[PDB]
Structure 1
Amino acid sequence: DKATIPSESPFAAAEVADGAIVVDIAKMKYETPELHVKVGDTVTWINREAMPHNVHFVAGVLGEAALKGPMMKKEQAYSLTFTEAGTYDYHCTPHPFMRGKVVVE
């Protein structure tokens, strides 16, 4: 399956194109509780703070295996391309209280 991964590893914020769909991460929060994109859209999370954060979809969400995203340092980014309509929950691994959702339409 339900996403592809453009880049295995994190990458520099400055890498993200201008029109890109972006979830900023700051003060221990994802930017939106709930992002709406279409089938085929790439979402990029950008950690804006020093505290490392990632995105993590449990097993069965984006396919059989969990998708545990790599931890992003300050000013690092990570993308996912959503290939199937549906609602996908995630959290930040060390931080269960940081929760988001991608709604793919």
Structure 2
Amino acid sequence: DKATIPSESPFAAAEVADGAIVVDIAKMKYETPELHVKVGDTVTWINREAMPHNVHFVAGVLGEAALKGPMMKKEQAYSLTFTEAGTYDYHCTPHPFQRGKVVVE
């Protein structure tokens, strides 16, 4: 796999780690739809809305399996630690019109 998952379930926005690279989910979009990070960085998405959201990477992107992240309620967060360079497209499972990518270099 090209990322590790610190927590399989969401956690409170207040618990975001030092040095995490935050992507807000606000106004029904990933507010940073193209994020550039380095190997070893942890990206944390934070849902700021009442509607739940996740991040979903199809098979072959983060690794062999799809990664269907857990649904984040309002003011919850979810992280991925990227361990290899690449370009990692994702969408929101219930809202597939909501798309983003993480470029790891």
TM-score class, shorter: over 0.9
Alpha-carbon shift at residue 27 of structure 1 (Å) = 1.4
Query: Hey, what's the Cα distance between the residues in 1 that align with 2:100 and 2:28?
Result: 12
Alpha-carbon shift at residue 20 of structure 1 (Å) = 2.3
Please state whether the residue corresponding to 1:45 is helix, strand or coil: strand
Superposed CA offset, 1:28-76 (max 9, x none): 1001110000001000000001000000000010011000000000000
Q: Which runs of 5+ in 1 are unaligned?
A: none
Please state whether the residue corresponding to 2:33 is helix, strand or coil: coil
Query: Hey, what's the Cα distance between the residues in 2 that align with 1:56 and 1:20?
Result: 19
- TM-score w.r.t. structure 1 length? 0.97
Assess if the C-alpha contact under 8 Å between 2:20 and 2:41 holds in 1. no
After TM superposition, which residue ranges in structure 1, 4 or more long, deviate above 2 angstroms?
17-20
Query: Hey, what's the Cα distance between the residues in 2 that align with 1:68 and 1:19?
Result: 24
Q: Which runs of 5+ in 2 are unaligned?
A: none
Change (3 A) 1:71 1:88: same
Change (3 A) 1:78 1:102: same
Query: Hey, what's the Cα distance between the residues in 2 that align with 1:26 and 1:41?
Result: 22
Aligned length: 105
Query: Hey, what's the Cα distance between the residues in 1 that align with 2:18 and 2:65?
Result: 32
Query: Hey, what's the Cα distance between the residues in 2 that align with 1:9 and 1:33?
Result: 22
